[PDB]
Design an enzyme around this catalytic site. Structure first.
Site, PDB file in Angstrom:
ATOM      1  N   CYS A 143       1.755   1.622 -12.816  1.00 18.52           N
ATOM      2  CA  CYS A 143       2.123   1.661 -11.400  1.00 18.52           C
ATOM      3  C   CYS A 143       1.553   0.488 -10.592  1.00 18.52           C
ATOM      4  O   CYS A 143       2.176   0.022  -9.636  1.00 18.52           O
ATOM      5  CB  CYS A 143       1.655   2.993 -10.788  1.00 18.52           C
ATOM      6  SG  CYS A 143      -0.045   3.529 -11.273  1.00 18.52           S
TER       7      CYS A 143
ATOM      8  N   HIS B  86      -6.823   3.215  -5.150  1.00 19.34           N
ATOM      9  CA  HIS B  86      -5.881   4.154  -5.756  1.00 19.34           C
ATOM     10  C   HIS B  86      -6.176   5.666  -5.650  1.00 19.34           C
ATOM     11  O   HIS B  86      -7.324   6.102  -5.799  1.00 19.34           O
ATOM     12  CB  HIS B  86      -5.783   3.743  -7.235  1.00 19.34           C
ATOM     13  CG  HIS B  86      -4.533   4.183  -7.930  1.00 19.34           C
ATOM     14  ND1 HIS B  86      -4.187   5.507  -8.085  1.00 19.34           N
ATOM     15  CD2 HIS B  86      -3.572   3.465  -8.560  1.00 19.34           C
ATOM     16  CE1 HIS B  86      -3.066   5.589  -8.780  1.00 19.34           C
ATOM     17  NE2 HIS B  86      -2.672   4.364  -9.081  1.00 19.34           N
TER      18      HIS B  86
END
Ligand SMILES: NC(=O)c1ccc[n+]([C@@H]2O[C@H](COP(=O)([O-])OP(=O)(O)OC[C@H]3O[C@@H](n4cnc5c(N)ncnc54)[C@H](O)[C@@H]3O)[C@@H](O)[C@H]2O)c1
Ligand SMILES: NC(=O)c1ccc[n+]([C@@H]2O[C@H](COP(=O)([O-])OP(=O)(O)OC[C@H]3O[C@@H](n4cnc5c(N)ncnc54)[C@H](O)[C@@H]3O)[C@@H](O)[C@H]2O)c1
Ligand SMILES: NC(=O)c1ccc[n+]([C@@H]2O[C@H](COP(=O)([O-])OP(=O)(O)OC[C@H]3O[C@@H](n4cnc5c(N)ncnc54)[C@H](O)[C@@H]3O)[C@@H](O)[C@H]2O)c1
Ligand SMILES: NC(=O)c1ccc[n+]([C@@H]2O[C@H](COP(=O)([O-])OP(=O)(O)OC[C@H]3O[C@@H](n4cnc5c(N)ncnc54)[C@H](O)[C@@H]3O)[C@@H](O)[C@H]2O)c1
Lengths: 337, 337, 336, 337
Positions: free
Chosen positions: C153, C180
């Site tokens: 990602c 994150h």
């Protein structure tokens, strides 16, 4: 002609009210003004972006130094803390949605009428000679000649509906209640001063006990419940969606299954659209945007000793309430004489 | 135990400050006054129970009618929004720890002096021409002349110590900085009106970018870095403890293990008790109550292309910074002419 | 028309099936799900999602070995061993490998070694293994590749605009940190783990964790090998992340120039992939975005003319899943 | 003397148990072995650093590659998921603290005996008819010839103590219960696989209904309560500390004040050290590290209709329970035949 609506306090309930109304079908209302200590900068940005609801699928762009545009419609964004000084008479306002949380008392709510508005709906329990109504429970009793009314609190709207059913069908002798509630902007983010030393504690870090008027408020819309209920609240680390846990000693011996049925009936007949039995093993978030004021978690329903009933009902305290506020606004319009 | 101190604003910093001091041995300072608009009752509670520091281990009982007793120490609790009115000259106050975050400039903090106080230490960046210090970096330059001084921000207290080292032992051409910081009182629990549309967003739900002058502020305590640094901050869902991400381009080629070895030198020498190097793989909660304004996370130290260095530092924005306010206050105390 | 099998009905697995369900006319036909948790838990978890919300469709189980999503019927098998999977018997061409376990040839292979003729690992791949980031080097995909990785990602957020930077200012060297949201890899409360940092209570800490992402960019943009690097910072959010890239370019430049560069590419070679946001927004606002990398325009800084700092937002679950449903499209298309 | 102890499942309870014991003075126990699936690596690091308890104030470090030293005292660190293969016979293991939560039946726990250990204490409810005990309620009934025993659940330890007081002093006819509990390692971080579709939902983002066998487990240690209580649980976004909301119908008519008084009475006598009454407005965090199994929140006590009592008690599920586990182990070691 459609009724002109003003929103005082463009906060959580204020903004949920507009987005609710927007999604309405043939609203007998027309939101034409907003008022709040912030101007177009906030009023606009916060209506378009919401950490709880999401982004508003509509065009929300400022519209001049004093207004915002929502899908072509223009809404006046005034900004004065003193309700007596609002352009209500000048804008021909019919109904004001009092969502400031600081004009819930009659002398305060009346300032809106002195300023032009012909009516005011307090989005909270009221103080003073203020009739209280709960859609699906007794709003039918409203009267056009009543200038200031309360739509009660989010907990009374979850409780009232199914207390009505429980009492009517089984006879509530007495009972207690606890609402494990999602935190609100009244609590602090970090340990900080507050009149209530519990709400002063870090909201997202704790399970914070706090009082509730719901249990006693129910008696306003369900006279028969006067002096029978009682309860407290537990504020938990969730941004929205809450649950009320009720335990009542019914007069007619019964059982969990029989109880859930009674609710499903109500959900189909009288409380159609306000109440709703859920049979899915869900969780809080699954109820975001629930249009029901109360959704029984049928599988949690318990019956101890034949007459002691436990019932857990979910509700989205921001959205569900706001919708209800709209329904009451529509009721006030349709009785407009 | 010699110089009389009064704490203005008993918020997070103020209370942390009090506990830090309470824990020092043989102290220059004697805390005899707490100005809090919330009264004795509230001050006593929030000092005793802290969602972040845990229960303060000392006997906190109220004293008389307008004071509190901390381990037998009677501390007065006054209560006035206007600093100019506080009983400073009356109580004999020498130093005031400005911890309200609303009296940062001269006229502001100056009111304490009008009130009878001799010196003011603003627990935040000052406004305009206001001496600013960082213990371990330039606190020794404090002149007993200056009545109002600043201890800079908590982030500026994490950089300066190790930026002093990097610029000295490697020469800093330029750099950028991003501090992943815990939320704080200036953010909103839920989306609500705020001047900064970023800060108006539910703190415990998002990653909120927000500006920070900490970067530029280093140039006040380390003249050499003027105009060389700059940065931003990202507020994240943790109640306390923050980390600074620094990327500077040095002029002297080097590698990671050297940079780190460098930091370890400052640890045992000119930066003892201020800078620290951590070799174990820890997480934010492990740095709660760290007396070091900055702790290097060695295993995160990276050097790209011989001269682009990245250093990650940990700090308790609340506790550690308070330990520093006490240090600066002690410096002021031992340089009292 | 091209039988797909989702292996590992986790976040990606389920996010994948929803993104796809949304595609107006996919060359992909999902015919089977394979998780280690029965059909019931499969239908339920698909219908209700704490991060995505209730899946608007009809997710009722069809028998005790399959489910019926909005009409169509997907088989739901359950085996911890890929080799035992009914791929040939179902005729699967591509198995989306989203379990996090079989991320290398020996592992991912068992899938092809039992039916499927092609696997798309929804994460980095071990050693020698074809890696692709849609919008950066997805074209280099030759049908010759039996197994391929859609990267992580972060790499899918970093690679897009890192390309635009090098192509327009030329990256000398670069460092990177990613703030994150935590993920399944992390423990809920301090509990045993290979990574002493991933063992800590996910929702209570800012957890430093190493990552490939940076070096990964080298794979999709060869011209970056030995220049980028960086750590990751896990934080108390259940979804959405932000990458903080700091690069030293050669071409003296300034803030708005860099942004102008991003905006162009945004509506040219990277439309639908990269986007430029000029709004003072926050993580939650970027939930469900379809752009691998959304630059936060007002945060772009430039020190000393050639040190550039860019902040980009990306939904680490949806956005990534969308690309997987694209690298699958890529595959389906180039089918020989 | 001093029975040699072994800890199986160095989890939250496993690690809290060790710290609880470690803090005791004059312990009949000596912990000399730890078994988990992690080995000295996780073991040393996670005993020292705790996101919930904080840094352990002890010198923790590995000793060789098969043990650790806590303040010099060396404790073996084995690692086999099959009790049968544990070095119990050679280590001379007397009692085993089973905290894996996967060997909770005779066939399971028994494996520790089959491996050398003399006794097993399951840190959780036992399957079938394993002798269950709750310190302060019936642990005294323990018998030396019972190889495998259970310390019941954490909720049961909270509920049992004050249910004992209520029934004794007012007679419990029937009751229902709801425990707003912190989430545990059994729930998933983000929506994932779980036999229970509720516990499957991300733990720190929801209020999660979930069954509880606490209400009926009470009848195990207080027979007079068999068949009389049922209840449910609601996991909320807090890492530690829970609260039970108990509502009962009593025989003897009473009022809020009378009930509290009874608790304080017991608090000072029969349940001394096990039960407490808190009179200040506290929040969940203030109760971290409470050695009590149950702490009443006096101001929340309500009585509706003379005999429908509602009581609320806090408890640290982790630390509190573990303290009771040490107590049960002491009890076992003091009747060692
Ligand atoms: N959030 C809920 O669950 C909820 C549910 C039902 C009812 N309510 C009730 O609704 C009211 C508001 O609740 P909320 O959650 O939206 O809070 P909120 O803080 O989000 O909203 C209050 C708003 O009013 C504005 N305001 C304050 N004083 C003002 C003044 N003098 N003039 C104009 N604007 C002013 C504020 O800037 C803010 O935007 C309270 O009475 C509350 O009890 C809240
Ligand atoms: N939280 C941190 O990490 C941190 C770290 C370093 C510096 N600071 C700075 O310290 C200051 C305070 O921060 P805080 O986090 O403790 O905030 P806070 O909200 O907890 O504390 C502010 C306090 O000042 C009181 N106050 C406000 N106006 C007052 C007045 N006129 N008279 C008396 N008291 C008044 C408030 O009621 C409150 O008790 C700010 O300037 C902040 O930037 C904060
Ligand atoms: N969550 C994100 O943001 C994200 C983003 C990009 C890439 N990824 C990658 O995707 C992969 C999975 O991530 P996730 O977030 O979906 O995690 P996850 O834990 O929710 O999904 C793993 C799934 O695989 C199943 N599984 C495990 N072993 C299996 C086996 N032998 N057979 C069948 N099913 C098995 C699990 O039951 C679960 O449904 C990882 O490789 C990760 O690097 C995750
Ligand atoms: N945390 C609480 O609130 C709590 C309170 C009271 C009782 N309990 C009970 O205690 C038990 C443990 O709970 P916990 O929260 O400490 O769990 P946990 O997840 O933190 O720890 C369980 C531990 O056992 C280990 N383990 C699992 N299977 C094993 C095996 N075969 N061999 C060796 N080690 C193995 C794990 O690696 C882990 O270290 C459960 O039965 C639970 O019901 C928990």
């Amino acid at each position: 002609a459609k009724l002109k609506v003003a929103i005082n306090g463009f906060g959580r309930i204020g903004r949920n009210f507009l987005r609710c109304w927007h999604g309405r079908k043939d609203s007998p209302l027309d939101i034409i003004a907003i008022n709040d200590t912030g101007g177009v900068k906030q009023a606009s940005h916060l209506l378009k972006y919401d950490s709880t609801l999401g982004i508003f699928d509509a065009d929300v762009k400022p519209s001049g130094e004093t207004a915002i545009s929502v899908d072509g419609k223009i809404i006046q964004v005034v900004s004065n803390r003193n309700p007596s000084l609002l352009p209500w008479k000048e804008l021909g306002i019919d109904i004001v949605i009092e969502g400031t949380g600081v004009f819930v008392d009659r002398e305060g709510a009346g300032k809106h009428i002195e300023a032009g508005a012909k009516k005011v709906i307090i989005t909270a329990p009221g103080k003073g000679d203020i009739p209280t109504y709960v859609v699906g429970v007794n709003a039918d009793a409203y009267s056009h000649d009543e200038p200031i009314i309360s739509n009660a609190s989010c907990t009374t709207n979850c409780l009232a509906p199914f207390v009505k059913v429980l009492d009517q069908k089984f006879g509530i002798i007495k009972g207690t209640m606890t609402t494990t509630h999602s935190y609100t902007g009244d609590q602090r983010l970090l340990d900080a001063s507050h009149r209530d030393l519990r709400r002063a504690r870090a909201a997202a870090l704790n399970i914070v006990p706090t009082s509730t008027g719901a249990a006693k408020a129910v008696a306003l819309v369900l006279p028969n419940l006067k002096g029978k209920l009682n309860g407290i609240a537990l504020r938990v680390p969730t941004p929205n969606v809450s649950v009320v846990d009720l335990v009542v000693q019914v007069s007619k011996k019964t059982f969990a299954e029989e109880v859930n049925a009674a609710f499903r009936d109500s959900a189909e007949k009288e409380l159609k659209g306000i109440l709703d039995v859920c049979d899915e093993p869900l969780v809080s978030v699954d109820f975001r945007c629930s249009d029901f004021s109360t959704t029984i978690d049928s599988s949690l329903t318990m019956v101890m000793g034949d007459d002691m009933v436990k019932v857990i009902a979910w509700y989205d305290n921001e959205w569900g309430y706001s919708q209800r506020v709209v329904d009451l606004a529509d009721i006030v319009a349709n009785n407009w004489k």
